[PDB]
């Protein structure tokens, strides 16, 4: 498993460019921000609900513990 015999590929053309000639931060904010928002929207629907369920059970548990450790039936 070293370079030279990984697999077989044909008719692929890859162009590149020296790191000393092209910019290190190309459109970091012009294109970075919309891409970040798109990636956020892609996964927020499947990420948030489990954690907001946690937040709900957390607030309910703390407030119920506070309520239980109180005085009423006497």
Partner 1 sequence: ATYAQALQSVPETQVSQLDNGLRVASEQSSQPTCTVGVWIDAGSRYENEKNNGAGYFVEHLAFKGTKNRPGSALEKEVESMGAHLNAYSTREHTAYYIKALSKDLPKAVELLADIVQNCSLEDSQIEKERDVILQELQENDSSMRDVVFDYLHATAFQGTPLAQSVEGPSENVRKLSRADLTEYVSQHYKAPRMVLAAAGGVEHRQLLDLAQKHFSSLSGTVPAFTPCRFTGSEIRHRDDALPLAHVAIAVEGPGWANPDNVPLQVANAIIGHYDSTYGGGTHMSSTLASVAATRKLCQSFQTFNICYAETGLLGAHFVCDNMSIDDMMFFLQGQWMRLCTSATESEVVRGKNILRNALVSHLDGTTPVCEDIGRSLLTYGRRIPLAEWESRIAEVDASVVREVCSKYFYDQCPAVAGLGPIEQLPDYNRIRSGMFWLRF
Ligand X SMILES: CCCCCCCCCCCCCCCCCC(=O)OC[C@H](COP(=O)(O)OCCN)OC(=O)CCCCCCCCCCCCCCCCC
Considering CB under 6 A, how many residues would be counted as binding ligand X?
4
Radius of gyration of the chain (CA): 27
CA distance 53 to 63: 15
Which residue in 27, 28, 53, 55 binds ligand X (CB under 6 A)? 28
Q: How far is the CB of 35 from ligand X (least distance, A)?
A: 14
Q: How far is the CB of 25 from partner 1 (least distance, A)?
A: 18
Residues that bind ligand X (CB under 6 A): 23-25, 28
């Amino acid at each position: 498993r070293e370079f030279g015999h990984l697999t077989r590929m044909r008719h692929v053309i890859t162009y590149s460019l020296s790191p000393f000639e092209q910019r290190a931060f190309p459109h970091y904010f012009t294109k970075g921000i919309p891409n970040v928002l798109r990636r956020t929207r892609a996964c927020i629907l499947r990420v948030a609900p489990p954690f907001v369920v946690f937040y709900l059970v957390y607030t309910w548990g703390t407030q119920e513990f506070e309520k239980s450790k109180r005085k009423n039936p006497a």
